[PDB]
């Protein structure tokens, strides 16, 4: 039994979503390993399977519910359970292939998709890019519904792919970035929904690159600056870890702590 964190979109407030994300982070990493003030996720290699995942239980005002499984190494969604079925993205190696069989063992039906959970593939299936897919409590509410109905036959592939894209960003990306968590709190605050702006999208795209640069950094300065975009799409470069401390909450482990 992996740890379970419960969140409802019903009556969702800025605080309840903040408490939720805080708790998700708390389960992803012990915080024992920090590098330049930024917590590093457990190193995949050597990690015992009984520690490998956490579970995120999502429910809405519709009183439908689904269970997401997150990999503690990258904080990313690997699959989910609705009712008597579990569904998993295509594992990219044998060792990942084996890991997920420890998820949702008592379900009647077990499916592995032909596709992975990367944005490029999901976008192709959903028929839309991330920048065309709106985010907020309303979109999460619908995504949860689409995911639950998939197990009953009421959800088509394109809507499923779209719902993944919504959940991954509002949960995984938000746990990874305080900045992305912030934009979600803002949507909830004004009770609005909107597609993510360029600052959100480029962060998402850059998480692995920023994990590497921060961990390989000499003294906190980057050998290669990292270009990001602001909300308005204008471009600027990050030369130093100091400016990302407010931005990025967790990193994938790239190397030994020295």
């Amino acid at each position, epitope marked *: 039994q992996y740890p379970i964190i419960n969140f409802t979109t019903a009556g969702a407030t800025v605080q309840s979503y903040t408490n939720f994300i805080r708790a998700v982070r708390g389960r992803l990493t012990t915080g024992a390993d920090v590098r330049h003030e930024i917590p590093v996720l457990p190193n995949r290699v050597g990690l015992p399977i009984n520690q490998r995942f956490i579970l995120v239980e999502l429910s809405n005002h519709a009183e439908l519910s689904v269970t997401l499984a997150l990999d503690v190494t990258n904080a990313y969604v690997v699959g989910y359970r609705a009712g008597n079925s579990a569904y998993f993205f295509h594992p990219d190696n044998q060792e990942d292939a084996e890991a997920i069989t420890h998820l949702f063992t008592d379900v009647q039906n077990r*499916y*592995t998709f*032909a596709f992975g959970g990367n944005y490029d593939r999901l976008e192709q299936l959903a028929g839309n890019l991330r920048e065309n897919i709106e985010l907020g409590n309303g979109p999460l509410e619908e995504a949860i519904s689409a995911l639950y109905y998939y197990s009953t036959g009421g959800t088509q592939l394109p809507t499923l792919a779209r719902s993944f894209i919504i959940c991954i960003q509002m949960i995984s990306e938000a746990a990874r970035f305080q900045y992305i968590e912030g934009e979600m709190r803002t949507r909830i605050r004004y009770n609005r929904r909107s597609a993510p702006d360029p600052s959100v999208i480029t962060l998402e795209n850059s998480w692995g690159r920023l994990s590497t640069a921060i961990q390989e950094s000499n003294q906190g300065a980057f050998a290669s600056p990292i270009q990001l975009q602001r909300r308005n799409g204008s471009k600027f470069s990050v030369y130093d870890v100091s400016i990302l401390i407010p931005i990025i909450a967790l990193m994938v482990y790239r190397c030994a702590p020295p």
Partner: nanobody
Amino acid sequence: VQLAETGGGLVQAGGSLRLSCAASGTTFSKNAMAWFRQAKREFVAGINWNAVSTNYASVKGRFTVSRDNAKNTVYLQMNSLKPEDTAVYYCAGSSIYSDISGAATVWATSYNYWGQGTQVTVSS
């Protein structure tokens, strides 16, 4: 998706047939495949994307399922054929799932693409 099947027809008993099915355009190496048969439409054999996991129905120890991802082909090798095996055989696939485990393996509904059937008739 396009399918091309070979093998079928009349064979005697204790004798054998090989059914072959080529698929396209899809990503076949990523696709769960299955064989079904009718009279009277049920699951016969099925195989996952990497061919490390296979299921059989009545046919166990006789029929074996195989695939070559290089050719986008899936095979059914039928051995020790008995009159009760006479049926129309359909190759099925899923462009959605790489692996279908549990009950859903045998649901015709788990598979979103289907070849035309081939009559297989095993005489006494």
